[PDB]
């Protein structure tokens, strides 16, 4: 599995991503049941003038997650939920400013 | 829905990623009959000698989105030459050169 | 086509970025058929400590390939298993630190 989050520089701090890798870490192998040391987190910053929301310059908070498909919509939603949560309560960021998605790739897709 | 820029660095100027952001904001708030405050745009650059064509270092622009699914293919394909067309104009970039793609991601694939 | 190799900055080389964006497009127009102009190949980098695997900072590697649908499985396949073949030779990486994705896109869904 592959998570990535996108933030505006600045935003997170080298604790704050230690924590969130952690946490999402955590997440995935609690509700997926895969060994951790296959769970990647990478964190990338956006320039301050290179994000935008409704057209205007702004602060979004994007995290995107790839995982093998074969799971129910339970357990996508479940990582969702918890992803969202985690990322608000490290960050004390607001929601709406907060997007989460977690896509499948078909296991003949990928090779690790 | 996302949308994501990938250009080598020194290609866009702030008032040019202004100027795409509203643009692509505008044209698919209009042809999804969506609200402007879920759009989302980012902006990313490559380091010189990081993107390649045939083989050889070049300069293509890469433009992803990422909207919801449900839509016509008709829907789809407006919001590609929309975007496609204004990229053209705004930088001056050759057809061939740039290259678009609007993926449907299921409903409940995200959470926002 | 639209290759994309993720690594932690300082990973590659500029001789090895050249090698596998040749290599690299050189698997695709081999299993596909399709002419080398359309093949792009892209490198980014992340900064070192914003790279995780399992819980703590790492140095994986992730390449996706973003192609057309249409195909059979076992020219992705050949595809997946000759970029990862190559790109543990080009560098050495571990095995279990490589990362090879191809995923689908409609022709409909893509714009060039």
Redesign the interface.
């Known amino acids: 599995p592959?998570y990535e989050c996108?933030t505006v520089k600045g935003t997170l701090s080298?604790r704050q991503?230690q924590s969130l890798?952690?946490s999402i870490?955590?997440i995935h192998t609690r509700e997926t049941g895969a060994p951790?040391?296959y769970?990647?987190?990478?964190?990338?910053?956006?320039?301050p003038?290179?994000?935008?929301?409704?057209?205007?310059?702004?602060t979004?908070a994007?995290i995107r997650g790839?995982i093998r498909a074969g799971r129910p919509?339970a357990t996508?939603?479940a990582i969702?939920?918890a992803i969202?949560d985690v990322y608000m309560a490290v960050t004390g960021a607001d929601?709406?400013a907060?997007?989460?998605?977690?896509?499948?790739?078909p296991a003949?897709?990928?090779?690790?």
């Open positions: 592959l996108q080298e991503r890798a952690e870490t955590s951790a040391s769970v990647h987190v990478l964190f990338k910053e956006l320039e003038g290179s994000a935008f929301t409704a057209g205007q310059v702004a979004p994007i790839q919509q996508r939603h969702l939920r969202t929601a709406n907060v997007v989460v998605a977690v896509v499948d790739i003949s897709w990928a090779m690790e």
